[PDB]
Design a protein around this nucleic acid. Structure first.
Length: 141
RNA sequence: GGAUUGAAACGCCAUGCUCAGGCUGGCGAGUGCGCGCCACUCAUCAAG
């Protein structure tokens, strides 16, 4: 669970002449002190065959995922980054094991020496179990 | 391999809590109160 913090901020300039008539406005800004998010995804090769999604497209997709947040900087988003990317590659065109059982292999738990609310990625320990025989595990990050 | 009222779908761009203000002015621990009254080191033991 995350506990967003509300930050009150002020601005020197007023926007309208009406409110000018002592001249400052107070706004607020919502931030998550820290949070680690898990995103699942699926790529269907049979659908790709119907639209030409090729291997160069897949490599570009992995590149986007690992570099997704590098160009999305803004005043509101703070610092976001991709920490880890596990890819399960199936031998067969359609799958070889149930997806939900593969997602279970990625265990995310808190480091041993860390207590209290998490404030950095170092407070978490992430491990990947052994995948079934028909699936290959790749760690792009 | 035609159709999961489906297929596609950012809440998003940005914004000083600031400018400043002695905890101060001053107030005896002080007046006083015997360690003191007594009590043998002593009764013996060649020098070789």
């Amino acid at each position: 669970p995350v506990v967003p913090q509300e930050v009150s901020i002020t601005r020197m300039a007023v926007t309208t002449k009406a409110e000018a008539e002592d001249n400052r406005t107070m706004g607020r800004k919502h931030i998550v002190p820290y949070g680690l998010y898990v995103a699942h995804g699926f790529i269907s090769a049979p659908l790709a065959e119907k639209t030409g999604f090729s291997d160069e497209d897949l490599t570009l997709f992995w590149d986007a995922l690992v570099n997704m947040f590098e160009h999305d900087r803004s005043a509101a988003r703070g610092l976001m980054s991709s920490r880890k990317l596990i890819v399960f590659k199936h031998q067969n065109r359609l799958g070889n094991a149930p997806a939900h059982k593969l997602f279970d292999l990625v265990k995310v738990s808190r480091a041993e020496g860390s207590s209290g609310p998490a404030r950095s990625f170092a407070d978490y320990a992430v491990t990947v179990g052994q995948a079934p025989e028909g699936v290959e595990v790749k760690e792009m990050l």
